[PDB]
Amino acid sequence: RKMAFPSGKVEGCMVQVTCGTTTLNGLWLDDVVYCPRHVICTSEDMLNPNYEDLLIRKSNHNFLVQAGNVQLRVIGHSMQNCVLKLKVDTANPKTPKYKFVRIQPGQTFSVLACYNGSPSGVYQCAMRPNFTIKGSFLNGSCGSVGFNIDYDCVSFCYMHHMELPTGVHAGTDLEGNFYGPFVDRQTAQAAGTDTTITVNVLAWLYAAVINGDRWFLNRFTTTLNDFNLVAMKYNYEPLTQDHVDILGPLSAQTGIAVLDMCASLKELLQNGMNGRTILGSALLEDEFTPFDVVRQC
Amino acid sequence: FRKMAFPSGKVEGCMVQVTCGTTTLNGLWLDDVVYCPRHVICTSEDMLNPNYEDLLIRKSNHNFLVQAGNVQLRVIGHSMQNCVLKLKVDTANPKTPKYKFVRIQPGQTFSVLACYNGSPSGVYQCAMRPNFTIKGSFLNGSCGSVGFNIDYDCVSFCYMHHMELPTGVHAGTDLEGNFYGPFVDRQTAQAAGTDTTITVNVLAWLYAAVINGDRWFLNRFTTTLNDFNLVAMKYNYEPLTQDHVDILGPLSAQTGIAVLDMCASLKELLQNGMNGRTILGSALLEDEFTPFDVVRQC
Ligand SMILES: *[C@H](O)[C@H](C[C@@H]1CC=NC1=O)NC(=O)[C@H](CC(C)C)NC(=O)OCc1ccccc1F
């Protein structure tokens, strides 16, 4: 089962941010609220916004920040890349221990989808190799954040800014730097060609085994380089030696050598599933990391 | 589409741990009552067929250890409601949300906050199968984890976890302690009925495909509900109820496609197969999204 981190620590930080006729979500940590800077745009602005220009023309009192029924007074504002930072006069007592991180493609994270400052749903995503994320984000979701929880610490890794015409999504880290070649303007943008996260497919196959599913296994083996040749042919990421290392615990747990699973994946790529499913799916799933699988088994 | 859970924070604020001896499971702390599975009072010698009523008479308030984190909550009364233990505690939970206890129907979905020793580990979306099992992720120590939906500010609690079956699926009760399905809280091998496909959710999925402009499978014909139900059962699909017909109303309205017309389209897919075609990027029909789930993500 695809499993998200419990979202309570993040729900206590979500607020609503309005400028003009534009409302989206912000993240309130300590006495600062972080949100996408395109909240300051209007219809005409959005096509080619000169954000520094638009921002200097704004006053602190142009920002309406609401935490539920309560309006927070903005006592200062600044911009860090694509993220607007609003200083408010009061600190959030619900602020958890946190940090800002930039995740690598193939890493997963939970998304708390929010609208008008209110949490609506939580789900698990992966950072695609082409730096998109396949999410459920509608109008008004901008400022929703993605995160992981290690111990009692929330690592914020994603803030949501836009949809692409293919229906995937793009956004920034909490320093305001986009993942991928995207820009926060109202244009149709295309991503690089997406590739499949191989180490995650391998983790998922080990999971199907742990759960007693093994029809796809074979007795064949393969070298790492010969597997990577076939992987790349089918637009799968090559498997690094650290990726192999990371798969050790699942290998140990099932007694299936990593390169043996690679030989099984190779057969699937070349032949398909021929009606058969794995863990219920007709497709090879690649949004489960080794850690995600282990933690759940 | 994707499975999307409700935000879990209102439920996290209610999770505690309940311990008898060395046996620790999770409980749900609402106002001044903690709810947990009664088998917290079982020993290993008792697991195969406990006498819960006799096991409880031997129990006093001061034998129950209830903790929120490392903070003890003193128990001041206890009772048993079916398969659930109710422990009155001396502190009202300040984080109690608006809530209700609901008993859901097969096919309905809900979020599960998987907890261990009172600490949440993850949240995910489950479907109650037509045979009253759920396909969860539960390890040892997960009992007492709850399933819920959130409507506005109000948490509807619908599931409490009690056990695993040989097939690897899971079974449990509502918050009044009544099992879903024919199962009992004893350490015995129990078999669920044969699982069937959740027809109402497949229909919801077809509506979702139509809303997104994927509508090759729509035909010019209709059927009666009885005719559809009789065919459906031959393909191991659940028959539709009047409540199923009714909760498809909004999607029927959104699309202008009568429920019974969508049933005729489904019938043709069941009889003729997909013919190497996809619906929403899939050769498989999905049955774990309810009409409400579809509306949420659309
Ligand atoms: C903020 O809430 C919003 C979220 C997206 C709206 C619908 N699904 C979403 O994920 N963000 C925006 O609307 C973006 C604002 C820009 C100034 C960055 N724009 C956007 O998502 O639309 C992209 C676009 C533009 C033109 C043609 C196609 C297309 F996809």
XYZ file of C-alpha atoms and ligand atoms in Angstrom:
625
model
C 0.000 0.000 0.000
C 1.214 3.534 -0.890
C 1.596 5.232 2.492
C 2.047 8.901 3.376
C 3.592 10.387 6.485
C 1.108 11.578 9.118
C 0.400 15.172 8.189
C -0.629 16.688 11.533
C 2.628 18.550 12.076
C 2.234 20.266 8.689
C -1.508 20.986 8.968
C -0.724 23.172 11.954
C 1.386 25.435 9.714
C -0.930 26.015 6.769
C -2.434 29.462 6.284
C -4.245 31.365 3.557
C -2.524 34.205 1.663
C -4.389 36.709 -0.488
C -3.185 39.546 -2.675
C -5.766 41.265 -4.853
C -8.047 38.631 -6.390
C -5.514 35.818 -5.892
C -5.680 33.378 -2.972
C -3.379 30.433 -2.289
C -1.755 28.628 0.628
C 1.196 29.553 2.783
C 3.432 27.742 5.242
C 3.723 29.548 8.619
C 6.888 28.595 10.516
C 7.972 30.679 13.546
C 7.022 34.275 12.522
C 7.452 33.835 8.745
C 4.963 32.716 6.088
C 6.318 31.163 2.876
C 4.217 31.028 -0.270
C 4.565 31.085 -4.049
C 5.478 34.539 -5.268
C 3.019 34.437 -8.140
C 0.302 35.356 -5.614
C 1.273 38.983 -6.370
C 0.369 38.651 -10.054
C -2.770 39.685 -11.889
C -4.197 38.321 -15.121
C -1.998 40.461 -17.368
C 1.084 40.058 -15.158
C 1.090 36.285 -15.275
C 2.160 35.880 -18.906
C 5.588 37.504 -18.361
C 5.832 38.798 -14.786
C 8.739 41.017 -13.769
C 8.623 39.818 -10.186
C 11.141 42.271 -8.701
C 9.166 45.124 -10.294
C 5.824 43.778 -9.100
C 7.181 43.159 -5.606
C 8.620 46.630 -4.975
C 5.215 48.119 -5.836
C 3.557 46.071 -3.046
C 3.016 47.143 0.557
C 2.958 44.926 3.629
C -0.714 45.867 3.933
C -1.470 44.465 0.465
C -1.064 40.920 1.889
C -4.060 39.353 3.646
C -2.849 36.381 5.705
C -5.539 34.330 7.480
C -4.970 31.492 9.957
C -8.559 30.286 10.114
C -10.661 33.093 11.585
C -7.560 35.127 12.507
C -5.755 37.646 10.305
C -2.006 37.881 10.899
C -0.353 41.267 10.475
C 2.417 41.333 7.874
C 5.299 43.421 9.243
C 7.730 42.744 6.401
C 8.163 40.895 3.121
C 10.916 39.663 0.859
C 11.511 37.286 -2.023
C 13.850 34.277 -2.219
C 13.799 33.018 -5.793
C 10.218 31.912 -6.511
C 9.145 32.005 -2.837
C 7.666 35.045 -1.138
C 8.463 35.346 2.579
C 6.045 37.355 4.740
C 7.119 38.308 8.243
C 4.145 38.409 10.588
C 3.929 39.929 14.037
C 3.042 36.650 15.787
C 4.825 33.313 15.971
C 3.192 29.958 15.246
C 3.139 27.911 18.477
C 2.409 24.817 16.375
C 5.762 25.129 14.550
C 7.472 21.703 14.569
C 11.152 20.958 14.484
C 11.877 21.310 10.786
C 14.441 21.767 8.057
C 14.477 22.671 4.377
C 15.920 20.095 2.001
C 16.255 19.661 -1.734
C 15.392 16.073 -2.651
C 16.950 14.057 -5.474
C 14.883 12.560 -8.280
C 13.701 9.101 -7.332
C 13.219 10.172 -3.713
C 9.651 10.189 -2.412
C 7.747 12.577 -0.168
C 4.278 13.204 1.189
C 2.146 16.037 -0.171
C -0.477 17.808 1.936
C -2.858 19.232 -0.639
C -4.499 22.389 0.744
C -7.072 24.838 -0.617
C -7.714 28.290 0.901
C -5.335 27.436 3.721
C -7.309 24.289 4.695
C -5.914 20.747 4.407
C -7.876 18.521 2.060
C -5.778 15.425 1.411
C -2.431 13.739 1.814
C -0.648 11.415 -0.583
C 2.756 10.079 -1.567
C 4.687 11.337 -4.624
C 8.104 10.846 -6.092
C 10.358 13.403 -7.690
C 10.435 12.180 -11.299
C 13.779 12.005 -13.099
C 12.518 14.824 -15.365
C 11.687 16.848 -12.200
C 7.901 16.700 -12.456
C 5.599 15.116 -9.916
C 2.425 13.216 -10.664
C 0.020 14.770 -8.190
C -3.578 15.679 -7.479
C -3.418 19.469 -7.534
C -6.329 21.641 -8.651
C -6.878 25.405 -8.816
C -5.966 26.961 -5.500
C -3.512 24.237 -4.464
C -0.432 26.442 -4.876
C 1.537 26.757 -1.670
C 0.754 23.162 -0.731
C 3.970 21.563 0.488
C 5.707 18.214 0.300
C 7.696 16.738 3.161
C 9.209 13.784 4.952
C 9.336 13.122 8.694
C 12.504 11.713 10.288
C 11.984 11.309 14.038
C 10.116 14.426 15.206
C 11.728 16.541 12.441
C 9.809 17.641 9.340
C 12.006 18.031 6.261
C 10.176 20.289 3.828
C 11.267 19.547 0.270
C 8.557 20.843 -2.073
C 6.168 23.723 -2.618
C 3.614 23.591 -5.379
C 3.447 26.185 -8.189
C 1.942 24.851 -11.415
C 0.542 22.227 -13.758
C 1.916 21.301 -17.151
C -0.263 20.570 -20.184
C 0.374 16.821 -19.775
C -1.252 17.064 -16.350
C 1.886 16.512 -14.248
C 3.021 19.183 -11.798
C 6.042 21.355 -11.048
C 7.274 23.372 -8.103
C 10.172 24.467 -5.951
C 12.076 23.671 -2.837
C 11.514 25.949 0.137
C 14.425 28.103 -1.041
C 12.240 28.871 -4.060
C 14.364 27.067 -6.687
C 12.336 25.046 -9.172
C 12.876 21.388 -9.614
C 13.470 21.104 -13.341
C 13.554 23.588 -16.188
C 10.294 25.289 -15.344
C 9.382 28.902 -14.743
C 6.549 30.500 -12.786
C 4.784 32.148 -15.690
C 1.409 31.358 -17.273
C 2.756 29.410 -20.259
C 2.449 25.866 -21.557
C 5.672 24.109 -20.573
C 6.979 20.692 -21.566
C 9.306 18.542 -19.499
C 12.255 16.484 -20.564
C 11.540 12.910 -21.489
C 10.575 11.015 -18.382
C 12.409 7.856 -17.359
C 11.431 5.105 -14.929
C 13.034 5.001 -11.455
C 14.737 1.585 -11.662
C 15.825 1.171 -8.056
C 12.215 1.832 -7.041
C 10.884 -0.780 -9.470
C 13.352 -3.213 -7.943
C 12.228 -2.270 -4.428
C 8.614 -2.819 -5.477
C 9.379 -6.269 -6.932
C 11.017 -7.265 -3.638
C 7.813 -6.091 -1.982
C 5.683 -8.331 -4.183
C 7.926 -11.209 -3.104
C 7.749 -10.349 0.609
C 3.956 -10.485 0.154
C 4.157 -13.973 -1.390
C 3.971 -12.866 -5.033
C 6.760 -14.384 -7.201
C 5.536 -15.435 -10.671
C 7.892 -12.942 -12.399
C 11.048 -14.465 -10.856
C 13.450 -16.508 -12.970
C 16.629 -18.507 -12.452
C 18.622 -16.370 -14.893
C 21.176 -13.823 -13.746
C 22.826 -10.776 -15.309
C 25.765 -8.489 -14.858
C 25.135 -4.960 -13.671
C 26.344 -3.387 -16.907
C 24.305 -5.721 -19.111
C 21.222 -4.964 -17.044
C 21.875 -1.218 -17.397
C 22.204 -1.644 -21.167
C 18.686 -3.092 -21.335
C 17.340 -0.643 -18.754
C 18.500 2.354 -20.741
C 17.077 0.885 -23.935
C 13.625 0.905 -22.304
C 14.115 4.382 -20.780
C 14.860 3.118 -17.288
C 17.514 4.835 -15.173
C 20.768 2.878 -14.891
C 21.337 1.189 -11.550
C 24.261 2.622 -9.587
C 26.333 0.560 -7.178
C 24.936 2.623 -4.308
C 21.451 1.731 -5.573
C 22.508 -1.927 -5.358
C 23.865 -1.382 -1.845
C 20.615 0.298 -0.817
C 18.768 -2.833 -1.942
C 20.758 -5.113 0.368
C 18.272 -5.314 3.243
C 15.479 -6.344 0.891
C 17.898 -8.739 -0.785
C 18.848 -10.268 2.570
C 15.229 -10.389 3.748
C 14.113 -12.392 0.703
C 17.381 -14.176 -0.110
C 17.209 -12.875 -3.686
C 20.411 -11.342 -4.982
C 20.021 -7.859 -6.371
C 21.275 -8.913 -9.797
C 18.825 -11.827 -9.745
C 15.960 -9.368 -9.342
C 17.576 -7.335 -12.137
C 17.404 -10.396 -14.382
C 13.728 -10.750 -13.505
C 13.049 -7.091 -14.290
C 14.903 -7.489 -17.585
C 12.593 -10.361 -18.579
C 9.525 -8.274 -17.686
C 10.773 -5.327 -19.765
C 11.370 -7.491 -22.819
C 8.210 -9.623 -22.511
C 5.699 -7.703 -20.433
C 3.256 -9.108 -17.927
C 1.024 -10.823 -20.524
C -2.177 -10.164 -18.581
C -0.612 -10.998 -15.238
C -0.472 -8.357 -12.510
C 1.931 -7.679 -9.651
C 0.598 -6.475 -6.303
C -2.603 -5.726 -8.215
C -0.976 -3.582 -10.917
C -0.735 -4.087 -14.675
C 2.287 -1.743 -14.763
C 5.643 -1.722 -13.006
C 5.342 0.842 -10.208
C 8.337 3.117 -9.554
C 7.221 5.466 -6.728
C 8.307 3.204 -3.823
C 11.852 3.629 -2.569
C 13.801 0.885 -0.805
C 13.179 2.724 2.474
C 9.443 3.029 1.836
C 9.247 -0.724 1.200
C 11.409 -1.698 4.188
C 9.696 0.620 6.685
C 6.419 -1.075 5.731
C 7.668 -4.691 6.018
C -5.892 9.408 -10.313
C -4.279 8.274 -7.068
C -5.380 7.069 -3.671
C -5.536 10.147 -1.447
C -6.047 10.017 2.300
C -7.590 12.594 4.560
C -5.177 14.755 6.555
C -4.514 12.765 9.698
C -3.836 15.519 12.240
C -7.239 15.485 13.946
C -6.842 11.722 14.471
C -3.200 11.888 15.513
C -4.322 14.144 18.379
C -6.502 11.284 19.677
C -4.103 8.332 19.542
C -2.890 6.766 22.791
C -1.444 3.449 23.924
C -3.184 0.963 26.224
C -1.186 -1.704 28.022
C -2.138 -4.726 30.087
C 0.949 -6.468 31.413
C 3.300 -6.484 28.429
C 0.505 -6.349 25.818
C 0.367 -2.851 24.297
C -1.952 -1.698 21.530
C -3.365 1.626 20.410
C -6.486 3.355 21.669
C -8.605 6.331 20.669
C -9.010 9.110 23.238
C -12.138 11.222 22.711
C -13.405 13.456 25.503
C -12.860 11.373 28.680
C -13.098 7.892 27.121
C -10.403 5.717 25.557
C -11.585 3.102 23.047
C -9.434 0.089 22.224
C -9.756 -3.562 21.187
C -10.799 -5.733 24.109
C -8.156 -8.304 23.346
C -5.622 -6.050 25.089
C -6.728 -8.021 28.202
C -5.788 -11.408 26.683
C -2.733 -13.442 27.587
C -1.157 -16.002 25.251
C -2.866 -18.811 27.194
C -6.159 -16.992 26.413
C -5.668 -16.159 22.733
C -7.224 -19.260 21.125
C -10.653 -18.686 22.705
C -10.713 -16.084 25.479
C -13.547 -15.807 27.974
C -13.611 -12.030 27.727
C -16.353 -11.559 30.310
C -14.486 -13.639 32.892
C -11.199 -11.970 31.897
C -12.756 -8.566 32.548
C -14.212 -9.370 35.985
C -10.627 -10.015 37.144
C -9.569 -6.604 35.852
C -9.539 -3.373 37.871
C -9.071 0.214 36.730
C -5.571 0.169 38.213
C -4.484 -2.712 35.943
C -4.818 -0.557 32.788
C -1.886 1.622 31.717
C -3.044 4.331 29.327
C -0.441 6.739 27.982
C -0.409 9.685 25.611
C 3.253 9.631 24.743
C 5.046 9.070 28.042
C 2.263 10.827 29.997
C 0.013 8.487 31.970
C -3.767 8.947 31.855
C -5.413 7.536 34.965
C -8.289 5.147 34.263
C -11.352 5.714 36.463
C -13.799 3.220 34.954
C -13.987 0.417 32.445
C -16.621 -1.411 30.457
C -16.902 -3.656 27.419
C -19.045 -2.849 24.364
C -19.010 -5.883 22.072
C -15.377 -6.276 20.981
C -14.222 -2.834 22.198
C -12.989 -1.824 25.639
C -14.106 1.571 26.914
C -11.863 3.122 29.565
C -13.039 6.231 31.378
C -10.065 8.477 32.123
C -9.668 11.463 34.409
C -8.700 13.918 31.650
C -10.822 15.104 28.741
C -8.770 15.162 25.561
C -8.217 18.874 24.703
C -7.631 17.840 21.060
C -10.970 16.041 20.725
C -12.379 17.013 17.316
C -15.976 17.171 16.335
C -16.670 13.485 15.712
C -19.176 10.735 15.094
C -19.105 6.921 14.965
C -20.372 5.510 11.675
C -20.681 1.981 10.368
C -19.754 2.052 6.694
C -20.974 -0.164 3.843
C -18.851 -2.491 1.716
C -17.262 -0.529 -1.094
C -16.794 2.648 0.967
C -13.246 3.956 1.346
C -11.574 5.448 4.401
C -8.180 6.592 5.583
C -6.235 4.499 8.092
C -3.754 6.057 10.512
C -1.384 3.156 11.132
C -0.033 3.467 14.665
C 2.423 1.568 16.844
C 2.707 2.068 20.608
C 0.456 5.079 20.159
C 2.790 6.719 17.599
C 1.444 7.241 14.068
C 3.659 5.848 11.329
C 1.645 6.456 8.173
C -1.708 7.210 6.644
C -3.266 5.516 3.631
C -6.588 4.983 1.893
C -8.390 1.620 2.268
C -11.472 0.138 0.659
C -13.810 -2.087 2.632
C -14.101 -5.165 0.390
C -17.496 -6.768 -0.299
C -16.387 -9.662 1.942
C -15.762 -7.221 4.866
C -11.987 -7.415 4.760
C -9.597 -4.575 3.995
C -6.234 -4.854 2.255
C -4.173 -2.874 4.726
C -0.600 -2.533 5.846
C -0.612 -3.600 9.499
C 2.273 -5.060 11.469
C 2.302 -6.450 14.995
C 1.284 -3.728 17.429
C -1.096 -2.043 14.958
C -4.364 -3.120 16.639
C -6.438 -0.189 17.756
C -5.404 1.886 14.734
C -8.504 3.517 13.306
C -10.044 4.282 9.955
C -11.921 7.494 9.336
C -13.409 10.003 6.945
C -13.433 13.772 7.503
C -16.523 15.829 6.550
C -15.829 19.534 7.103
C -14.621 19.801 10.699
C -16.103 16.441 11.730
C -14.217 13.144 11.875
C -16.363 10.092 11.218
C -14.668 7.084 12.773
C -15.609 3.860 10.984
C -12.952 1.188 11.650
C -10.793 -0.156 14.467
C -8.171 -2.766 13.652
C -8.186 -6.163 15.389
C -6.627 -8.919 13.263
C -5.098 -10.490 10.157
C -6.432 -13.473 8.219
C -4.470 -16.313 6.568
C -4.824 -14.665 3.137
C -3.037 -11.577 4.492
C -6.108 -9.322 4.558
C -7.346 -7.615 7.699
C -10.532 -7.478 9.736
C -11.863 -5.268 12.478
C -14.831 -3.506 14.013
C -16.666 -0.233 14.044
C -16.229 2.040 17.071
C -19.174 0.362 18.782
C -17.145 -2.852 18.670
C -19.201 -4.777 16.097
C -17.059 -6.662 13.618
C -17.423 -6.043 9.925
C -18.178 -9.450 8.458
C -18.403 -12.834 10.163
C -15.148 -12.626 12.125
C -14.407 -12.988 15.856
C -11.486 -11.714 17.959
C -9.803 -15.057 18.627
C -6.410 -16.349 17.543
C -7.906 -18.778 15.019
C -7.650 -19.221 11.267
C -10.758 -17.666 9.747
C -11.627 -17.422 6.072
C -13.456 -14.579 4.430
C -15.984 -15.136 1.691
C -14.800 -14.927 -1.879
C -13.940 -11.346 -2.749
C -15.921 -9.680 -5.517
C -15.389 -6.490 -7.501
C -16.929 -3.290 -6.123
C -19.367 -2.451 -8.925
C -20.375 0.997 -7.668
C -16.747 2.082 -7.637
C -16.079 0.734 -11.123
C -19.075 2.738 -12.302
C -17.639 5.789 -10.531
C -14.358 5.166 -12.382
C -16.190 5.035 -15.726
C -17.869 8.358 -14.931
C -14.416 9.758 -14.077
C -13.107 8.570 -17.445
C -16.035 10.340 -19.144
C -15.482 13.575 -17.213
C -11.913 13.529 -18.581
C -13.121 12.996 -22.143
C -12.430 9.250 -22.349
C -15.761 7.892 -23.528
C -15.337 5.256 -26.275
C -17.096 2.658 -24.084
C -20.462 4.459 -23.917
C -23.204 2.671 -25.899
C -26.666 3.628 -27.147
C -28.518 1.170 -24.898
C -29.709 0.749 -21.301
C -30.710 -2.066 -18.949
C -32.742 -2.778 -15.871
C -31.018 -2.897 -12.516
C -32.121 -6.496 -11.992
C -30.817 -7.561 -15.408
C -27.507 -5.841 -14.696
C -27.234 -7.378 -11.223
C -27.861 -10.874 -12.555
C -25.129 -10.509 -15.178
C -22.734 -8.774 -12.787
C -22.822 -11.698 -10.379
C -21.734 -14.027 -13.199
C -18.508 -11.977 -13.477
C -17.893 -11.843 -9.681
C -19.074 -8.237 -9.471
C -21.173 -7.161 -6.497
C -24.839 -6.469 -7.265
C -25.818 -2.836 -7.001
C -28.011 -1.632 -4.172
C -30.427 1.272 -4.215
C -27.917 3.223 -2.108
C -25.243 2.595 -4.766
C -27.571 3.889 -7.456
C -28.220 6.958 -5.330
C -24.601 7.865 -4.549
C -23.874 7.764 -8.298
C -26.467 10.524 -8.735
C -24.050 13.466 -8.681
C -21.729 11.931 -11.296
C -24.747 10.950 -13.380
C -25.880 14.573 -13.185
C -22.422 15.980 -13.918
C -22.191 13.870 -17.105
C -25.825 13.523 -18.195
C -25.347 9.735 -18.384
C -28.073 7.852 -16.504
C -26.817 5.274 -14.029
C -28.581 2.458 -15.876
C -27.022 3.523 -19.177
C -23.589 3.374 -17.564
C -24.517 -0.104 -16.270
C -25.277 -1.213 -19.836
C -21.854 0.076 -20.923
C -20.221 -1.834 -18.077
C -22.187 -4.955 -19.000
C -20.822 -4.757 -22.549
C -17.280 -4.367 -21.209
C -17.770 -7.411 -18.965
C -19.206 -9.517 -21.799
C -16.971 -8.275 -24.631
C -13.796 -7.349 -22.764
C -11.671 -4.303 -23.499
C -10.411 -5.489 -26.913
C -6.913 -4.198 -26.208
C -8.100 -0.728 -25.198
C -7.451 1.394 -22.136
C -9.660 3.536 -19.919
C -7.841 6.341 -18.088
C -4.517 4.761 -19.033
C -5.461 1.304 -17.786
C -6.504 -2.029 -19.214
C -7.900 -2.803 -15.758
C -11.068 -1.390 -14.267
C -10.349 0.216 -10.895
C -12.707 -0.514 -7.981
C -11.145 1.371 -5.027
C -12.382 4.916 -5.880
C -15.873 5.777 -4.636
C -18.161 8.340 -6.275
C -17.013 10.765 -3.563
C -13.310 10.039 -4.207
C -13.844 10.789 -7.922
C -15.542 14.083 -7.118
C -12.709 15.041 -4.724
C -9.987 14.625 -7.356
C -12.152 16.187 -10.074
C -1.795 27.615 -8.181
O -2.853 27.170 -7.373
C -1.957 27.028 -9.557
C -2.005 25.449 -9.493
C -2.322 24.720 -10.815
C -3.744 25.140 -11.241
C -4.456 23.858 -11.766
N -3.612 22.720 -11.332
C -2.421 23.189 -10.787
O -1.537 22.467 -10.353
N -0.848 27.488 -10.405
C -0.992 28.105 -11.625
O -2.114 28.291 -12.095
C 0.210 28.586 -12.509
C 0.520 30.073 -12.245
C 1.733 30.628 -12.997
C 1.842 32.189 -12.912
C 3.028 29.951 -12.514
N -0.105 28.264 -13.912
C -0.548 27.000 -14.321
O -0.573 26.046 -13.560
O -0.961 26.802 -15.630
C -0.024 26.295 -16.592
C -0.479 26.404 -18.084
C -0.522 27.641 -18.785
C -0.930 27.743 -20.130
C -1.316 26.597 -20.832
C -1.290 25.361 -20.185
C -0.877 25.281 -18.830
F -0.857 24.080 -18.240
